């Protein structure tokens, strides 16, 4: 239960960005070293659910309210605000998986939008804003309603 939530942040963000055509380690640093558990790892399964959840989450949004990268608007001086703003109002009404699925969806989306614009570095910046919020802002909620085991139980 909770070992390295950051790995989950780096993974999802790296995966989504990898689907758009961007490389995480290319400009992420992952605050350590791109490795990620091979297979059969607890945390590994966690990312698997986040990837499956984010995929279905972004899909519904993409099918209904179109993609995200082609809507938002982040800059070198409003990225941390754009994120905090969407994550704030999103978790303002009350934290929850659905809010976390979007939290991760927005994180990876912003990175792609920042890289597409001219702020590849923002990928790692958001990486710290997302992870930090995940571990410090919603982490408690995670273990509260079951944790990554539940999220994995619902999506996995």
């Amino acid at each position: 239960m909770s070992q390295s939530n950051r790995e989950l942040v780096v993974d999802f963000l790296s995966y989504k960005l990898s689907q758009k055509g961007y490389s995480w380690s290319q400009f992420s640093d992952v605050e350590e070293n791109r490795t990620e558990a091979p297979e059969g790892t607890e945390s590994e399964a966690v990312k698997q659910a986040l990837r499956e959840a984010g995929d279905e989450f972004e899909l519904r949004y993409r099918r209904a309210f179109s993609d995200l990268t082609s809507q938002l608007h982040i800059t070198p001086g409003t990225a941390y605000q754009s994120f905090e703003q969407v994550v704030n109002e999103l978790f303002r009404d009350g934290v929850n998986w659905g809010r976390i699925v979007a939290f991760f969806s927005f994180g990876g989306a912003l990175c792609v939008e920042s890289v597409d614009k001219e702020m590849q570095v923002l990928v790692s910046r958001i990486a710290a804003w997302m992870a930090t919020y995940l571990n410090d802002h919603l982490e408690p909620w995670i273990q509260e309603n079951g944790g990554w085991d539940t999220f994995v139980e619902l999506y996995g």
Partner: peptide, 23 residues
Amino acid sequence: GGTMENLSRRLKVTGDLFDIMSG
């Protein structure tokens, strides 16, 4: 100004549809 707020709203609804508690 009218980008992030609207964005969050869209993510919010998607959450309700993809939230659930357990099982």
